[PDB]
Amino acid sequence: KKFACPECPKRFMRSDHLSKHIKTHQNKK
């Protein structure tokens, strides 16, 4: 529900710091 790294079952309260986190899930490529 809401926004949150769809890759890992975590929880966040924003889209900025939340996006930067998912940025490490797709290193390069």
Ligand SMILES: [Zn+2]
């Ligand atoms: Zn994640």
